[PDB]
């Protein structure tokens, strides 16, 4: 059995069993995170050891633990009690979603805030929002959420239309206490609804959209074996799934003639953070680590054929653990299919008389998740020509506020009285590289402009320069779109037939990075977002750019501490961390539900192959 | 009849007739360019005047002329003899393709160059290459082409595989003279072939690609009326076609309820230039103005159903003039269809219980052209949500050279002895804007970072600043990807329901602009390429960023001279010229035929609509 296979339901139950027998999962315990670990380097030969790692919350106030078990051997490998004031709180539990509203409903300061606004407490939804780390010393070591109110005029109303500004509350989830209720002033609660299925607001639905039928009459060109192993148009890989990261891709390789050549050992979105840019004390603390704090895999949608995923779809239904260690299946939580992708290569040659046209295809592996108001589609594409791509599709409902009467430098207007604060959605792709194997390096490549003169008399020449990143202390890089900057991962010990090192070139979109002041809390907690590209030496415990426990962690953790080890990355097992994000100044067209907007990156072969790798593509039927 | 309808065959014949009767098209005359002119501003009401503009070459050495005729009225509106030494030579004629080889075949200096290399003159193909303007005073006023040799080992061989380096020749096309033959040294003629249909090099073709069937069982959702008028999912526009520019889009508008709101009056690629970066005197002169020198519309491919254009395709077969004024149909030279485009908007709301998913579509209008070794697909997309996009798909066979033995700072290696010089492919999109009508302005929008402190105590705030471009002297702008710079075209007299000016935001890719030294010939002839965005006041004779006659024109013409008029562009009929390009350092995978690579831009509504414009999209069948 492939040691990269998906966790099965029986594997989760065995973790539950091992923890129970070990005395680690009594009735007061809640699993906040559970996931299989990747096989260790070199273990390929031989003998399974499927290890699972668990974060265990205790609802009685006892200390939480990090536990690794061996489902293979039925043992506890490690169990450590965590001092959350130092190393962070556990991830948010799904069971804590409703607690913030429930505690506030009977708090007299909250009820007073709502009475001044003539709002019925029974119609006041409270978003359970991650707290971060600011000035409130009582919160250190405590599991806090913060709450912002949204009025639901009726049970199928969109509360996002009716933010209650000037009001925020903090609660201690464990002790079940409201620690602070801040009311800075009354704002009108925007009156319009945002119900995008209401015929009054949609108007009569269009009748003009004729059907588009996409079918594969002989079925798809990719095979799935071993539960999650894909073979498609020379690509080979395994599709993993982790409750924190979502879909992960393992062992991406390309059959080049008779050789299976590795390209990327592990590909994941290791963090995704939404910083807000509104300096109001009602929201100036909000930074939602969708991945590290909430666990995006956990909230993956079940994707409906014909509507969520069109064409000939093959699904995976990954398993996760519920809060008590029982397996739960996410039905149709991963969609897989191949698509047409236009012209691959075309040339009509006058001299030879030959006219040639070939079509491209891509393999698509995706999931869609929902974190409160946000919805994101994570898409990995593999193309016939070797190009690898990632794309995020950001949609959902924008996070709202009041629109101040004097306007705002940090908030857009969507509807009368309704604002939407400025924010970014910033991702980190963790690419554990394996270009032709693990001995890799990274070069930064800039265009070079040349001055007209001797050896360049007509002033037309231009060139490129590549700079090797030799050690981690040199591997924190920024974009330079003006100089066409890219980063090439090569194998300096593997040369193509032209005696040049095989490589792949990372093409970024060069969007703005984290805008927050460098002295801010979020710049410290999300340092990775402040730079476009990081290279580290591989290490099995360096998994997320933000560290293991993001929630209410003071800062510094993660990449800035990994990098300080100043390890050799010049022909070594290395990891590329690419920051990329969307800067979102909301527009009216984003309201009441926003059209998808996208961000991502791609890697293209750069002398990896001896010549084009798609010459064996046949003329289309 | 819509005055934006395509030229018909009868219209071309009537031009021929009018010129013949007027004494302007005797047997020594060759039409180098012919195209309908756009209706003048305000002529909507009323009465046709279909005017055509013609550039007439004279093969006897008499001066060429620029002529505008009225096919409506059967008259010559204007005819002016051109002093090509001042205002430029005419565009390259298709009939001149073979002349460069034919003249050189019997020239003793050329034959000597080839004999030293043991090449059979009968197997030596010569690319007819535009000359530009350099140090050769004898060329001023003369119609010159330059030639580079490529060996074809047999009639169906790819000559690009066998460049003959160290050798270039210049010829006077009219006098039929070889003006110079420069032989700077012998290089090996690369030996490998590049025949991508040869089973020896492709290997056995793949059998793994299962079929993908895309159909529309009730036909497409767009209608074509009046020959070229498209109605699709609230969009309205006309598809034009000009032999120089290719597909042009007129009168792009969006039905918003009961109003037809204009967005863009005219959209075209007004120039496309390929500068080379190899300082060798054999190629340091090459800069191929595919649009302005060669006329891309002229070489549009006939696009084959199922292979070039998949799905339910509606074609236009535009008409052009041959060199004698006879109409010629480009069969299936424009493909039109709609496609699925993934998720449009999705949200799964916990509080309201509603789960919502809608799919996107785009309308696609494209053509594909071949200029020697290059092939380009020009694609215009319209999306349901109002986004407009352009994409170029660059493929074909890379222009080759020898690979020097000591390597090269300006040339990649593709195969033993085979080089491909560095180059860029730089486009200019001419967008004659009409945001809600003609009274428009442009603002440059940058992200603003804020310093932590008073009014921003937690250091999270960020904002934006918009700078109006008031006059043409302020409207030459450059990218700043780091600050998320975009440009917003608004109508300062048309406000959405929130009292904010309607607009569209141009999202560029922020690729490098022209790399050549600012003092170089190409920087002067292609000044537009040196900056990302230009705004001019509309004027009916300001059509191309490079002027009317690009071929062998000394420089300065075009945008830098338009801009100097310093006209008011703050709430006026304006035109946005966006430079965008690909910088191409060829890779081994580009050889022997290159996979498509892409570049483009998009515009997104920015407060143009009162709320999302796709709320009336129905749940998919
Ligand atoms: Cu957003
Ligand atoms: Cu190129």
UniProtKB/Swiss-Prot annotation, chains A, B:
Its cofactor is Cu cation; L-topaquinone. Its EC number is 1.4.3.21. Topaquinone (TPQ) is generated by copper-dependent autoxidation of a specific tyrosyl residue. Cu cation binds at residues 423, 425, 584. It holds the Pfam family AGAO-like_N2. The modification 2',4',5'-topaquinone is found at residue 374. Induction: By phenethylamine. The keyword Disulfide bond applies. Substrate binds at residues 288-299, 371-376. Disulfide bonds join 309-335. The active site is at residues 290, 374. It catalyses: a primary methyl amine + O2 + H2O = an aldehyde + H2O2 + NH4(+); 2-phenylethylamine + O2 + H2O = 2-phenylacetaldehyde + H2O2 + NH4(+). One of its GO terms (molecular function) is primary methylamine oxidase activity. Keywords: Copper, Disulfide bond, Metal-binding, Oxidoreductase, TPQ. One of its GO terms (biological process) is amine metabolic process. Binds 1 copper ion per subunit. InterPro entries: AGAO-like_N2 (IPR054157), Cu_Am_Ox_Cu-bd (IPR049947), Cu_Am_ox_TPQ-bd (IPR049948), Cu_amine_oxidase (IPR000269), Cu_amine_oxidase_C (IPR015798), Cu_amine_oxidase_C_sf (IPR036460), Cu_amine_oxidase_N-reg (IPR016182). NCBIfam families: PRK11504.1 (NF008559). PANTHER family: COPPER AMINE OXIDASE (PTHR10638), COPPER AMINE OXIDASE 1-RELATED (PTHR10638:SF86). Belongs to the copper/topaquinone oxidase family. Homodimer. Catalyzes the oxidative deamination of phenylethylamine to phenylacetaldehyde with the concomitant production of hydrogen peroxide and ammonia. This is Phenylethylamine oxidase. It comes from Arthrobacter globiformis.
């Amino acid at each position: 059995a492939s040691p990269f296979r998906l966790a099965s339901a029986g594997e989760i139950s065995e973790v539950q069993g091992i923890l129970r027998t070990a005395g680690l999962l009594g009735p007061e315990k809640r699993i906040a995170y559970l996931g299989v670990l990747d096989p260790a380097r070199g273990a390929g030969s031989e003998a399974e050891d499927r290890r699972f790692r668990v974060f265990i919350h205790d609802v009685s106030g006892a200390r939480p633990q990090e536990v690794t078990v061996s489902v293979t051997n039925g043992t506890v490998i490690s169990a450590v009690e965590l001092d959350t004031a130092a190393t962070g709180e556990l991830p948010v539990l799904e069971e804590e979603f409703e607690v913030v509203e429930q505690l506030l409903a009977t708090d007299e300061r909250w009820l007073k805030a709502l009475a001044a606004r003539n709002l019925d407490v029974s119609k006041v939804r409270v978003a359970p929002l991650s707290a971060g780390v600011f000035e409130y010393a009582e919160e250190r070591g405590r599991r806090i959420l913060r709450g912002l109110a949204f009025v639901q005029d009726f049970p199928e109303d969109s509360a996002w239309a009716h933010p209650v500004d000037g009001l925020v509350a903090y609660v201690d989830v464990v002790s079940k206490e409201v620690t602070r209720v801040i009311d800075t002033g009354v704002f009108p609660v925007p009156a319009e609804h945002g119900n995008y299925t209401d015929p009054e607001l949609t108007g009569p639905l269009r009748t003009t959209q004729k059907p588009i039928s996409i079918t594969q009459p002989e079925g798809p060109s990719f095979t799935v074996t071993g539960g999650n192993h894909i073979e498609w148009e020379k690509w080979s890989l395994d599709v993993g799934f982790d409750v924190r990261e979502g879909v992960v891709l393992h062992n991406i390789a390309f059959r080049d003639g008779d050789r299976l050549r590795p390209i990327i050992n592990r590909a994941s979105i290791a963090e995704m953070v939404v910083p807000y840019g509104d300096p109001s004390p009602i929201r100036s603390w909000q930074n939602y680590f969708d991945t590290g704090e909430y666990l995006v895999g956990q909230y993956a949608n079940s994707l409906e054929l014909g509507c969520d995923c069109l064409g000939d779809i093959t699904y995976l239904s990954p398993v996760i653990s519920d809060a008590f260690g029982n397996p739960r299946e996410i039905r149709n939580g991963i969609c897989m299919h191949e698509e047409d992708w236009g012209i691959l290569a075309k040339h009509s040659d006058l001299w030879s008389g030959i006219n040639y046209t070939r079509r491209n295809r891509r393999m698509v592996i995706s999931f869609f998740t929902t974190i409160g108001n946000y919805d994101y589609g994570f898409y990995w594409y593999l193309y016939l020509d070797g190009t690898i791509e990632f794309e995020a599709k950001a949609t959902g409902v924008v996070f709202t506020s009041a629109f101040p009467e004097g306007g705002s430098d940090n908030i857009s207007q969507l509807a009368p009285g309704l604002g939407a604060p400025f924010h970014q959605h910033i991702f980190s792709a963790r690419l554990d590289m394996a270009i032709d194997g693990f001995t890799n390096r990274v070069e930064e490549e800039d265009v070079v402009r040349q001055t007209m003169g001797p050896g360049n008399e007509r002033g037309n020449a231009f060139s490129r320069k590549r700079t090797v990143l030799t050690r981690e202390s040199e591997a924190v890089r920024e974009a330079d779109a003006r100089t066409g900057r890219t980063w090439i991962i090569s194998n300096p010990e593997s040369k193509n037939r032209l005696n040049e090192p095989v490589g792949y070139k990372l093409h970024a979109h060069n969007q703005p990075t984290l805008l927050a002041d460098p002295g801010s809390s979020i710049a410290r907690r999300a340092a990775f977002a402040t730079k476009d590209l990081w290279v580290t030496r591989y290490a099995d415990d360096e998994r997320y750019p933000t560290g293991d426990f993001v929630n209410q962690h003071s800062g510094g953790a993660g990449l800035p501490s990994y990098i300080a080890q100043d390890r050799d990355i010049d022909g070594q097992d290395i990891v590329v961390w690419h920051t990329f994000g969307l800067t979102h100044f909301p527009r009216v067209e984003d309201w009441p539900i926003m059209p998808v907007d996208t961000v991502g990156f791609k890697l293209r072969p750069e002398g990896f192959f001896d010549r084009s790798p798609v010459l064996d593509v046949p003329a289309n039927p």
